[PDB]
């Protein structure tokens, strides 16, 4: 995974990151990498910060606590949020307890908030769980959720499958030096040869 | 060598240290209801430090994500960071006094 293009040409302003920066990642070797992207409140896109509290997304859909992530918060106006509208962000907004990260709780049933369920009537103490964002051609960037990418900094013991280094350096001859080819290290002077190897 | 590696950004003992470490509990007076936050612990450094150093230089370096020039918005803050002692805590979050 050549993360070089992440920092080769990019203009991600207001970048925060806890742990290790994704740049210069070829130094470290691992087996599995996870980048989690999800949909959140449209008005809380600027309000996502470690700690703190809030009325929304605290007693119904709880954000992960002690989350170790790398917030690359670049605004988007052409990749997503297509003009006219969009109806794909449908999730439960009312629940009695929290929600574990990546919990797929979708049901056509009417959520019951009070002690007495409603018999499919729009009245008191009964609210529908599913909600669709009222996207408009001029809805506003403050209400249309713009994706902020975040990863998972985690460790686990396993033999590496996606892993490999690359440093590159000019090849110098006729001067003895410590050298490191692919895996094999040593010290000496390197000269041209006439030996023939098999391919 | 027991790591706790942020404490080894802070205070490091040599490999052949001879002497005694003594720690005891201070939940009664170091942490109490209504704010206790006056201890800081140097979240991260530029490199590991040799045994028996202090490293009191606490400035907003232009290193890490980008050259911050004091912005503090890219984790370039002088990483003295937080305190994190409260009366309840967990079993492994209380303040201890060690010599």
């Amino acid at each position, epitope marked *: 995974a050549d993360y070089s293009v992440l920092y080769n040409s990019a203009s991600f302003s207001t970048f925060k990151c806890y742990g290790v920066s994704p740049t210069k990642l070829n130094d470290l070797c691992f087996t599995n990498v996870y980048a989690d992207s999800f949909v959140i409140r449209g008005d809380e896109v600027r309000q996502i910060a470690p*700690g703190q*509290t809030g009325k929304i997304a605290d007693y119904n859909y709880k954000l992960p606590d002690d989350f170790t992530g790398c917030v690359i918060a670049w605004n988007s106006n052409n990749l997503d949020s297509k003009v006219g509208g969009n109806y794909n962000y449908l999730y439960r907004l009312f629940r009695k307890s929290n929600l574990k990260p990546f919990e797929r709780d979708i049901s056509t049933e009417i959520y019951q908030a009070g002690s007495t369920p409603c018999n499919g009537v729009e009245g008191f103490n009964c609210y529908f769980p599913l909600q669709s964002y009222g996207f408009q051609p001029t809805n506003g960037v403050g209400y249309q959720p713009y994706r902020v990418v975040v990863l998972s900094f985690e460790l686990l013991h396993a033999p590496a499958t996606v892993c490999g280094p690359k440093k590159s350096t000019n090849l110098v001859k006729n001067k003895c030096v410590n050298f490191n080819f692919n895996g094999l290290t040593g010290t000496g002077v390197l000269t041209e040869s006439n030996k023939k190897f098999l391919p | 060598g027991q790591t706790g590696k942020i404490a080894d950004y802070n205070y490091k003992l040599p490999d052949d240290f001879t002497g005694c470490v003594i720690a005891w509990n201070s939940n009664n007076l170091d942490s109490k209801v209504g*704010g206790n*936050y*006056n201890y800081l612990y140097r979240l991260f450094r530029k490199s590991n430090l040799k045994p028996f150093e202090r490293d009191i230089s606490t400035e907003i370096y232009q290193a890490g994500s980008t050259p911050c020039n004091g912005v503090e918005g890219f984790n370039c803050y002088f990483p*003295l*960071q*937080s*305190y994190g002692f409260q009366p309840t805590n967990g079993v492994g979050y209380q303040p201890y006094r060690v010599v």
Partner: nanobody
Amino acid sequence: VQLVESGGGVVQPGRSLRLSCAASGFTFSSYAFHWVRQAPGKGLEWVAVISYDGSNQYYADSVKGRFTISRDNSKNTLYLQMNSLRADDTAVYYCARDLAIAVAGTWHYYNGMDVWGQGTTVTVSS
């Protein structure tokens, strides 16, 4: 910044009362609050504390069991309910904010009083 207080009582013998204090000029949700009692000429007293999130609320020895506190950030207003009031409850009530210290970007509450309201006098008799 300014605080407003209301809910006085001419006489409340064995009655229920509601004190209301609202805030203006600053954010009401980002600070915890205190209700303060002052006897007619005696030392200043404390009756209850509400947190910024409302998860933790605390009362006093003589306050617990008969008085209640609550808040609402939609109206930027918090209230105190008064029940089973004895004749020795005549005082002046204040609604105050908590000092928050920012150390390394972390905020710390429950440090002291910064902003005081005008103070509403509540008197009880027979």
